[PDB]
């Protein structure tokens, strides 16, 4: 056999991200004494569209404290924030939509985005459009706090990790049916080369374990073990179950 399409993806030749027109990585401010023991307010100068993603970004201008000048930040915008608005960042920042606070400071039951799964990594969780996490509890000693992620999983993060109060904008993007193959073409043109798919059962046996035969069927169980090698993990990988869900 030959190297299958899934295997060729890691080579990163034509499967690199189409990133020519991206505006930059979306990250919060790097941790600073101001953010640790106070508020620093940045003015959202603009909100723009990043062609890769669905959530709009926010061009936010902060004033440098160590030197005269202004620094520019690109922060995933929350639903409801507007140009000309001042957002506060830090421990003492008031709890309002668009502000960046440590998780330990917000009460339970608040919705957050741009979460840091480890303190200081300037934003790693809850970033796709319309997603939010819920702070579901703080530890008695502080120092630790529990959140519920958009996937529905509970995660425990230290209390000093920061996040943005609110929900990331451009929510509901899924509910529009992509009516035609052209819209999908344009969608993936600015992300990757993952489309069109081509079913493996329609290939030849040389280039896919599903290929071959006179009737276009899998022929062998489609659930593959987690330990299957690279050219073998092709079906439902390490599936705990199959068929329609009931709860």
């Amino acid at each position: 056999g030959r190297v299958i399409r899934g295997q060729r993806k890691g080579r990163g030749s034509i499967f690199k991200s189409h990133n020519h027109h991206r505006k930059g990585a979306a990250k919060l401010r790097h941790l600073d004494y101001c953010e640790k023991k106070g508020y620093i307010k940045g003015l959202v100068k603009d909100i723009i569209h990043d062609p890769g993603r669905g959530a709009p970004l926010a061009k936010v201008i902060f004033k440098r404290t160590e030197k005269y000048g202004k620094k520019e930040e690109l922060i995933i915008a929350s639903e409801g924030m507007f140009t000309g608005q001042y957002i506060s960042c830090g421990t003492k920042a008031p709890l309002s939509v668009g502000n960046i606070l440590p998780i330990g400071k917000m009460p339970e039951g608040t919705l957050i985005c741009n979460l840091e799964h480890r303190t200081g990594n300037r934003g790693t969780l809850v970033k796709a459009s319309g997603c939010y996490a819920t702070v579901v509890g703080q530890s008695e000693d502080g120092k630790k706090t529990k959140v519920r992620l958009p996937s529905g999983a509970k995660k425990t993060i230290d209390a000093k990790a920061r996040a943005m109060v609110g929900v990331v904008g451009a929510g509901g993007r899924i509910d529009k049916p992509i009516l035609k193959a052209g819209v999908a073409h344009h969608k993936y043109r600015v992300k990757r080369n993952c489309w069109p798919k081509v079913r493996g059962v329609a290939m030849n046996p040389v280039e896919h374990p599903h290929g071959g035969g006179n009737h276009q069927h899998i022929g062998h169980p489609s659930t593959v073990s987690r330990s299957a090698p690279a050219g073998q993990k092709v079906g439902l990988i390490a599936a705990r179950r199959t068929g329609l869900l009931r709860g």
């Binding site: 603009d46 909100i47 723009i48 569209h49 669905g54 959530a55 709009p56 926010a58 915008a77 929350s78 639903e79 409801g80 924030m81 507007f82 140009t83 000309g84 709890l95 309002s96 939509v97 009460p107 039951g109 608040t110 919705l111 459009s129 319309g130 939010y132 109060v165 609110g166 929900v167 904008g169 451009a170 929510g171 509901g172 993007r173 509910d175 529009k176 049916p177 009516l179 035609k180």
Partner: protein, 85 residues
């Protein structure tokens, strides 16, 4: 005169795609192309610029919002809980 009985703006799609698919896309294109109240200037002149950005033709001020509407219920509920305190 009235040009279409019920297809509305989805008349651009002709007979292609399912009727249910066309009705579902109509329901949200109606609110994607609508004008919304600019709470900063009070004029109903806020239109979608891109997938999540809404610009007021009068204010020239833009705001992050939903994909197909200026506000989403999940966001307005969260804002209400926050402002309660």
């Amino acid at each position: 005169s009235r040009r279409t009985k019920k297809v509305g703006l989805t008349g651009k799609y002709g007979t292609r795609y399912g009727s249910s698919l066309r009705k579902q896309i109509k329901k949200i294109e109606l609110m994607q192309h609508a004008k919304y109240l600019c709470t900063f200037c009070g004029k109903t002149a806020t239109k979608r610029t891109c997938v999540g950005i809404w610009k007021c033709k009068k204010c020239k001020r833009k705001v992050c919002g939903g994909a197909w509407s200026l506000t989403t219920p999940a966001a307005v509920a969260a804002k209400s809980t926050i402002i309660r305190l």
